[PDB]
Design a protein around this ligand. Structure first.
Ligand code: WY1
Ligand code: WY1
Length: 265
């Protein structure tokens, strides 16, 4: 039954991602460990002394703030790739795929999924970081020197339009499943089984949107377009990352993330 395929995907989403949209919009709105606001250099340094004490003692605050923010981004990406891999291992039919095709799907899918889910922790003024314990302002990131000021703003632009669709986690879980189970990734061995897998997920998504969002007549084709938008956003992101790896010393790539980008686009 498709009602339960959707429920299983949604339950695996709530289980595997440490931050979900309901939790995020609470923190983002107005407790015990409120988010420290990072809006200039002074507050970045204060936040680092509390949230990453070992690094400060290692002397990271001698490095350019842009380098520390980039490596903060990388650490968050590595953790999200780990969650996405477990989420996917929990997608019905994914674990039955060929080992090599699981790697291919995740390799090309993870950053599309990341930037989709990143919208959940963004508002027009900034984004949540450090497991809900920091809030870094969009204007502070815009204030960094090139090229680092170009990292986050295209993702804010995507997220504000994405958030206007007013999806909830039950929608987003299916959307991310669909991103991962994409039958036209380069390098796929058994394209036929993946397309049938994708067809079933997208079928559930289309049906779920019908019942969950009866007011938005074209929400399904809108989300198809967002999937294309995300692939272009990821292509452009990989280009900026390659610029940074080559031009900026100190901003070395984490080994897990380097393998993801290797031969990607
Ligand atoms: C927004 C925020 C919150 C918490 C810590 C930090 N700074 C970081 C975070 C990370 Cl994961 N790494 C670094 S420096 C790593 C290095 O110089 O090798 N600096 C930042 C930039
Ligand atoms: C969930 C979350 C919140 C904040 C930042 C990130 N990682 C990002 C986001 C953006 Cl727009 N850019 C980067 S550059 C480092 C990388 O390509 O992994 N890393 C992630 C994955």
């Amino acid at each position: 039954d498709l009602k339960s395929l959707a429920k299983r995907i949604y339950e695996a989403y709530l289980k595997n991602f440490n931050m979900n949209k309901v939790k995020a919009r609470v923190i983002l709105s107005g407790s015990n460990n409120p988010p420290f606001v990072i809006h200039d250099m002074e507050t970045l340094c204060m936040a680092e002394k509390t949230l990453v004490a070992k690094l400060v003692a290692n002397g990271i605050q001698n490095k350019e703030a842009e380098v520390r923010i980039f490596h903060c981004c990388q650490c968050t990406s590595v953790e999200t790739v780990t969650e996405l891999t477990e989420f996917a291992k929990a997608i019905p039919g994914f674990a039955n795929l060929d080992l090599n095709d699981q790697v291919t799907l995740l390799k090309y899918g993870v950053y599309e999924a990341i930037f989709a889910m990143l919208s959940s922790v963004m508002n027009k003024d900034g984004m949540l970081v450090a497991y809900g314990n920091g809030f870094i302002t969009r204007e502070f990131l815009k204030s960094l020197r090139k090229p680092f000021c170009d990292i986050m703003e295209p993702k804010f632009d995507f997220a504000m339009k994405f958030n206007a669709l007013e999806l909830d986690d039950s929608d987003i879980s299916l959307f991310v499943a669909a991103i991962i189970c994409c039958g036209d990734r380069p390098g796929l061995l058994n394209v036929g089984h993946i397309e049938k897998m994708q067809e079933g997920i997208v079928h559930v998504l289309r049906l779920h949107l019908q019942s969950n969002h009866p007011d938005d007549i074209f929400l399904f084709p809108k989300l198809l377009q967002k999937m294309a938008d995300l692939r272009q956003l990821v292509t452009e992101h990989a280009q900026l990352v390659q610029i940074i790896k080559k031009t900026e010393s100190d901003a070395a790539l984490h080994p897990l993330l380097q393998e993801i980008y290797r031969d990607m686009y």
